[PDB]
Design an enzyme around this catalytic site. Structure first.
Site, short mmCIF file in Angstrom:
data_model
loop_
_atom_site.label_atom_id
_atom_site.label_comp_id
_atom_site.label_asym_id
_atom_site.label_seq_id
_atom_site.Cartn_x
_atom_site.Cartn_y
_atom_site.Cartn_z
CG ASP A 247 37.94 29.48 42.12
OD1 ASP A 247 38.48 29.58 43.23
OD2 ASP A 247 37.85 30.42 41.30
CB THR A 248 37.94 25.96 47.48
OG1 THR A 248 39.30 26.41 47.53
CG2 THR A 248 37.88 24.49 47.10
N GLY A 249 37.73 29.13 46.29
CA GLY A 249 37.64 30.54 46.61
C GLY A 249 36.54 31.27 45.88
C1 LIG Z 1 39.18 34.10 39.06
C2 LIG Z 1 40.16 33.00 39.42
C3 LIG Z 1 40.66 32.23 38.20
C4 LIG Z 1 41.39 33.54 40.16
N1 LIG Z 1 41.13 34.15 41.45
C5 LIG Z 1 40.88 33.30 42.58
C6 LIG Z 1 39.38 33.15 42.87
O1 LIG Z 1 39.25 32.02 43.71
C7 LIG Z 1 38.78 34.40 43.50
C8 LIG Z 1 39.25 34.70 44.94
C9 LIG Z 1 38.47 35.91 45.45
C10 LIG Z 1 37.51 35.73 46.43
C11 LIG Z 1 36.77 36.79 46.91
C12 LIG Z 1 37.00 38.07 46.41
C13 LIG Z 1 37.98 38.27 45.44
C14 LIG Z 1 38.72 37.19 44.96
N2 LIG Z 1 37.35 34.14 43.46
C15 LIG Z 1 36.37 34.77 42.65
O2 LIG Z 1 36.59 35.60 41.86
O3 LIG Z 1 35.12 34.27 42.89
C16 LIG Z 1 34.00 34.93 42.17
C17 LIG Z 1 33.22 34.04 41.79
O4 LIG Z 1 32.35 33.76 42.97
C18 LIG Z 1 32.36 35.09 43.73
O5 LIG Z 1 32.69 34.60 45.23
C19 LIG Z 1 33.86 35.12 45.52
C20 LIG Z 1 34.09 36.20 44.57
C21 LIG Z 1 33.23 35.82 43.30
S1 LIG Z 1 41.78 35.68 41.69
O6 LIG Z 1 41.53 36.10 43.04
O7 LIG Z 1 41.28 36.58 40.66
C22 LIG Z 1 43.58 35.54 41.48
C23 LIG Z 1 44.29 34.95 42.48
C24 LIG Z 1 45.65 34.82 42.38
C25 LIG Z 1 46.31 35.28 41.22
C26 LIG Z 1 45.62 35.84 40.24
C27 LIG Z 1 44.21 36.00 40.35
C28 LIG Z 1 46.60 36.24 39.16
O8 LIG Z 1 46.34 36.78 38.14
O9 LIG Z 1 47.90 35.83 39.60
B1 LIG Z 1 47.86 35.22 40.85
O10 LIG Z 1 48.86 35.82 41.70
O11 LIG Z 1 48.14 33.88 40.71
#
Ligand SMILES: CC(C)CN(C[C@@H](O)[C@H](Cc1ccccc1)NC(=O)O[C@H]1CO[C@H]2OCC[C@H]21)S(=O)(=O)c1ccc2c(c1)C(=O)O[B-]2(O)O
Ligand SMILES: [Cl-]
Ligand SMILES: [Cl-]
Ligand SMILES: [Cl-]
Ligand code: NA
Lengths: 99, 99
Positions: free
Chosen positions: A25-27
């Site tokens: 998860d690069t995000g």
């Molecule tokens: C959880 C993952 C499986 C999924 N996500 C991507 C993830 O990369 C997020 C991206 C993000 C980045 C910053 C702020 C909010 C979100 N990162 C994240 O939560 O990172 C945490 C861990 O480290 C911290 O650093 C960053 C935040 C903290 S999502 O955004 O929830 C997400 C994206 C697209 C869709 C859905 C959910 C869905 O249901 O349908 B969809 O349309 O496909």
């Protein structure tokens, strides 16, 4: 390997002797794993995801294998929808994004 | 380019005539952009992750320029804290994860 993105980049990890599936998860700044038992003390951390902020347990210096690559670093434990390997450990395995 | 992961992999995108900063996110199936107007029809969707769910508007066949590369696909618009370029568009620019 070179991982294309037509499917979710799911790998097998090994943590606490157990195999689990996780998403590269690069995000994600941080690595977040579903509830499990880990050794040592933990400290609190608030992380902010797509839906808002949550409390997780921060364990440092945890040994974890990711797709066969050994890493040792911080693992956050909490109510995440899937196990995510974040940049703190992707950097340890030498991962880059390329296009 | 080859993007290391010491910091968030942020790029400049162009969408609906606007420049925005967005995260190249292998952990997202789809692309999610903060509130803006887009042309055409849409339908509501709920997307969820850390912190729970948000409601977004799903627009199909939207063109984005991602770090200079044009791609077309579905874009979800709503109250995301960060603009996210997900796999649905990363594939189109030929992005891979390598280690
Ligand atoms: C959880 C993952 C499986 C999924 N996500 C991507 C993830 O990369 C997020 C991206 C993000 C980045 C910053 C702020 C909010 C979100 N990162 C994240 O939560 O990172 C945490 C861990 O480290 C911290 O650093 C960053 C935040 C903290 S999502 O955004 O929830 C997400 C994206 C697209 C869709 C859905 C959910 C869905 O249901 O349908 B969809 O349309 O496909
Ligand atoms: Cl606490
Ligand atoms: Cl770490
Ligand atoms: Cl699409
Ligand atoms: Na459309």
């Amino acid at each position: 390997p070179q991982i294309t993105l037509w499917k979710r980049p799911l790998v097998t990890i090994k943590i606490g002797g157990q195999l689990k599936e996780a998403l590269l998860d690069t995000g994600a700044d941080d690595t977040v794993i579903e509830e499990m038992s880990l050794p040592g003390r933990w400290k609190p951390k608030m992380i902010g995801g797509i839906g808002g902020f949550i409390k997780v347990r921060q364990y440092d210096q945890i040994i974890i294998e990711i797709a066969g690559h050994k890493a040792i670093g911080t693992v956050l434990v909490g109510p995440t929808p899937v196990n995510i390997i974040g940049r703190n450990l992707l950097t340890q395995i030498g991962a880059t994004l390329n296009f």
